[PDB]
Amino acid sequence: SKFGAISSVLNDIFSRLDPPEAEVQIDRLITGRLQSLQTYVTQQLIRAA
Amino acid sequence: LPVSMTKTSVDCTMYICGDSTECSNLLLQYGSFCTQLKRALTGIAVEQD
Amino acid sequence: NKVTLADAGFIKQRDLICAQKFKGLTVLPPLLTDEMIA
Amino acid sequence: NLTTRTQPPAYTNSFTRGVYYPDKVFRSSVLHSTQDLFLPFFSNVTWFHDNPVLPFNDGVYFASIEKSNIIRGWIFGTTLDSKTQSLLIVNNATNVVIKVCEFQFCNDPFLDEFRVYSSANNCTFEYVSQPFLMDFKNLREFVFKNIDGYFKIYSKHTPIIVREPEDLPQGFSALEPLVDLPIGINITRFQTLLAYYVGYLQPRTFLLKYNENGTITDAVDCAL
Amino acid sequence: DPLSETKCTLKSFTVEKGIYQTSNFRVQPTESIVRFPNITNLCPFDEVFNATRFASVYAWNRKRISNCVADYSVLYNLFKCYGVSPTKLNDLCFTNVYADSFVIRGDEVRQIAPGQGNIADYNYKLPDDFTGCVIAWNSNKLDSKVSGNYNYLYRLFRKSNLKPFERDISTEIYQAGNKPCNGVAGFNCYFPLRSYSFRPQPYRVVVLSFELLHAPATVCGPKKSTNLVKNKCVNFNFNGLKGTGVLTESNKKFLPFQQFGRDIADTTDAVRDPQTLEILDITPCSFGGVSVITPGTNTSNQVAVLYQGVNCTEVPVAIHADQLT
Amino acid sequence: LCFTNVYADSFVIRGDEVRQIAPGQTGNIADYNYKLPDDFTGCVIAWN
Ligand SMILES: *[C@@H]1O[C@H](CO)[C@@H](O[C@@H]2O[C@H](CO)[C@@H](O)[C@H](O)[C@H]2NC(C)=O)[C@H](O)[C@H]1NC(C)=O
Ligand SMILES: *[C@@H]1O[C@H](CO)[C@@H](O)[C@H](O)[C@H]1NC(C)=O
Ligand SMILES: *[C@@H]1O[C@H](CO)[C@@H](O)[C@H](O)[C@H]1NC(C)=O
Numbered sequence: 265s266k267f268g269a270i271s272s273v274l275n276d277i278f279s280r281l282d283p284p285e286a287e288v289q290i291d292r293l294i295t296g297r298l299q300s301l302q303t304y305v306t307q308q309l310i311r312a313a
Numbered sequence: 314l315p316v317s318m319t320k321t322s323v324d325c326t327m328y329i330c331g332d333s334t335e336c337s338n339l340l341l342q343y344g345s346f347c348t349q350l351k352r353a354l355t356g357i358a359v360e361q362d
Numbered sequence: 363n364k365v366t367l368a369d370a371g372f373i374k375q376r377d378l379i380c381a382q383k384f385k386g387l388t389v390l391p392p393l394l395t396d397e398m399i400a
Numbered sequence: 401n402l403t404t405r406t407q408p409p410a411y412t413n414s415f416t417r418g419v420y421y422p423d424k425v426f427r428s429s430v431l432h433s434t435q436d437l438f439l440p441f442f443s444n445v446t447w448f449h450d451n452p453v454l455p456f457n458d459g460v461y462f463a464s465i466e467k468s469n470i471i472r473g474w475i476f477g478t479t480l481d482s483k484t485q486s487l488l489i490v491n492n493a494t495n496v497v498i499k500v501c502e503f504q505f506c507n508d509p510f511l512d513e514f515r516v517y518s519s520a521n522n523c524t525f526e527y528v529s530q531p532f533l534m535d536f537k538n539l540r541e542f543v544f545k546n547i548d549g550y551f552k553i554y555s556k557h558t559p560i561i562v563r564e565p566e567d568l569p570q571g572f573s574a575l576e577p578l579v580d581l582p583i584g585i586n587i588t589r590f591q592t593l594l595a596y597y598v599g600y601l602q603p604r605t606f607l608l609k610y611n612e613n614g615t616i617t618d619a620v621d622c623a624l
Numbered sequence: 625d626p627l628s629e630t631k632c633t634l635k636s637f638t639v640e641k642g643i644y645q646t647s648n649f650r651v652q653p654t655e656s657i658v659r660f661p662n663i664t665n666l667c668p669f670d671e672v673f674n675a676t677r678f679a680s681v682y683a684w685n686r687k688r689i690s691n692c693v694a695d696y697s698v699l700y701n702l703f704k705c706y707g708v709s710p711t712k713l714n715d716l717c718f719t720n721v722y723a724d725s726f727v728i729r730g731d732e733v734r735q736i737a738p739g740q741g742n743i744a745d746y747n748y749k750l751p752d753d754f755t756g757c758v759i760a761w762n763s764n765k766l767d768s769k770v771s772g773n774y775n776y777l778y779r780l781f782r783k784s785n786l787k788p789f790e791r792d793i794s795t796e797i798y799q800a801g802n803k804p805c806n807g808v809a810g811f812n813c814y815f816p817l818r819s820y821s822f823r824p825q826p827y828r829v830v831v832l833s834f835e836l837l838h839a840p841a842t843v844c845g846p847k848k849s850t851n852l853v854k855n856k857c858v859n860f861n862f863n864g865l866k867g868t869g870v871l872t873e874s875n876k877k878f879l880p881f882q883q884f885g886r887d888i889a890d891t892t893d894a895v896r897d898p899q900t901l902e903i904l905d906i907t908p909c910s911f912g913g914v915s916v917i918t919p920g921t922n923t924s925n926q927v928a929v930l931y932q933g934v935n936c937t938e939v940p941v942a943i944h945a946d947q948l949t
Numbered sequence: 950l951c952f953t954n955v956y957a958d959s960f961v962i963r964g965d966e967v968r969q970i971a972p973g974q975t976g977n978i979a980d981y982n983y984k985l986p987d988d989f990t991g992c993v994i995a996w997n
Pocket of ligand 3: 612613
């Protein structure tokens with residue numbers, strides 16, 4: 265997924281865009297993948313009870 | 314009646330980043346998000362035993 | 363034989379559903395073996 | 401030439417046809433969803449037997465059931481004049497040459513040989529290859545679209561034992577891409593260069609099924 | 625030692641009796657193998673940027689570049705850039721790159737924009753999914769007199785919105801008023817075709833628009849390829865696709881048009897060689913998780929290391945030469 | 950605000966390259982003569 269960015273592959277955003285404008289497009293993916301991991305841990309902690 | 318559950322471990326850096334990128338230097342600005350999730354997962358892994 | 367397990371906890375190496383190991387999602391084996399439970 | 405005989409559009413049904421490869425990525429033992437411009441399942445297509453000027457609303461599926469090579473190609477372009485690099489297909493049974501030229505059109509075209517026009521101009525694209533054509537019995541399916549920069553072509557050739565009129569054969573067959581022509585024209589109208597089947601493409605979400613070898617075996621139309 | 629990493633992960637100096645997950649295990653690559661196509665014929669960029677003269681804005685032209693190796697340090701021989709940054713344009717590969725050029729007013733370099741114009745809405749529309757690089761070139765020294773070149777006209781109003789990459793060569797005047805006209809003037813029925821009024825700064829620009837989701841590459845870059853080594857963790861670079869993994873043989877059944885190969889989920893599992901034309905099987909090299917078994921720092925200092933999920937023939941045998949990472 | 954040590958560097962560039970010099974940029978001088986830092990806090994001053 266993209267989370268509102270240009271691509272999902274990090275090796276394209278790193279090898280295409282300009283270093284100081286990558287701290288938003290590769291911040292959206294990081295926050296989305298952190299929220300997905302927190303959601304997965306949350307439903308597993310719920311269903312473990 | 315169910316008794317146990319499949320114990321899952323999550324590599325935070327290999328999930329958020331892709332293990333071949335400079336994303337790992339940007340994940341250190343968050344610090345303790347990849348440790349709390351694996352701590353809660355280790356808790357489930359010992360709870361199912 | 364009626365519970366179709368789909369865990370990814372093994373050592374062995376077309377690919378199965380256990381390609382989630384390559385994304386950082388592994389499966390730990392339980393402490394008690396099924397022979398010990400039996 | 402003014403060869404004109406007496407001219408009523410007939411209709412038939414597409415028996416789960418019009419599925420191609422939306423990308424060149426190999427998949428195996430997976431079900432993949434694709435939101436692209438496909439042909440809808442069980443749709444009314446215009447079966448002719450005839451050469452009118454049909455529209456080109458963002459994609460036209462084509463088919464042909466013949467034994468000989470009496471069909472020869474197609475012509476595309478929004479204008480019937482000598483402008484905007486109108487596209488042409490031709491065949492001489494030993495090579496499949498395709499031209500993108502700026503000719504003014506004629507009334508009734510035939511290629512059995514530049515008799516489909518009367519003025520050659522400064523051409524744009526030339527391409528000679530042994531694919532793009534293979535030469536009742538023989539099926540010749542085609543899908544043409546001109547989205548996002550260039551011109552897509554998909555095709556597949558299968559034998560037919562089913563009768564000639566009013567019968568598109570049932571079963572699944574995937575259309576493989578031959579060449580992606582980087583032309584970039586704007587098409588509104590088109591006609592053929594003389595079976596006959598024309599169906600129009602719509603944006604629709606599909607659900608493809610890939611086998612162990614990577615061929616599309618079945619598909620699911622998610623809005624039927 | 626693993627005891628100190630168990631101390632660092634627990635953030636304490638005394639470690640109790642148990643098993644603790646400290647860190648991970650990853651084998652680092654060795655080679656830096658790049659594989660580019662065979663072509664050596666350069667790109668005719670001097671025909672794109674230089675000619676006898678340029679073309680109009682509505683009578684535009686896009687020059688195609690195919691079967692060429694591009695160069696962008698020679699682009700500054702005689703510049704804001706969208707999408708791909710120009711510092712990584714020297715090592716990327718595509719299928720085709722379009723070079724459309726038009727002429728604009730010196731007060732018109734700001735209006736033309738993918739997501740933002742006045743003359744553009746009716747003479748040249750640019751799509752929203754843009755990737756490409758624009759050239760800012762002044763021509764007040766090149767063209768400033770009472771009549772420089774009469775091959776350039778423009779119109780400022782049309783009947784509706786213009787779709788991207790559309791050209792109208794219709795010899796017909798337009799209107800914006802209430803009464804219909806055909807050739808004759810009157811209540812807002814005058815000519816839309818206006819010639820350029822040169823007086824003492826026309827801007828003559830060249831847009832070099834790139835692509836997305838590339839095919840098997842016809843154009844390439846000047847970077848030279850390297851030989852192919854299998855059966856080890858290699859940092860590869862196949863036509864601009866960066867990654868790291870073991871390039872094992874495929875044993876697959878690729879169709880003759882397919883070059884990409886994927887898993888059940890989104891994973892670059894298989895690729896095709898640009899020169900050997902042999903399909904491969906991308907597999908990441910050996911990794912896993914580490915758990916340290918300590919009996920307690922109040923009893924001893926010996927530790928036991930368990931690499932979770934791996935075979936015992938995948939551990940590094942160079943335990944003394946692990947300082948070079 | 951208070952800082953550690955202000956650094957003033959003077960150079961003469963063209964009229965087309967006042968924004969071409971940038972953190973992580975290319976061209977004629979941004980990749981071959983000079984480079985603004987990636988974590989550059991501070992400013993540049995360009996005038997006629
Ligand atoms: C690029 O050029 C090389 C050099 O000729 C091509 O490699 C040859 O490929 C054929 C079959 O494809 C082999 O029979 C030859 O032995 C190869 N030659 C060498 C020296 O290895 C390569 O195929 C070309 N690639 C493309 C895309 O045209
Ligand atoms: C580990 O590797 C050896 C040889 O490569 C093999 O014989 C053995 O079966 C492997 N271990 C497991 C658990 O499969
Ligand atoms: C896949 O290919 C093999 C041999 O090429 C063939 O035996 C098999 O039938 C094919 N699979 C299908 C579904 O046709």
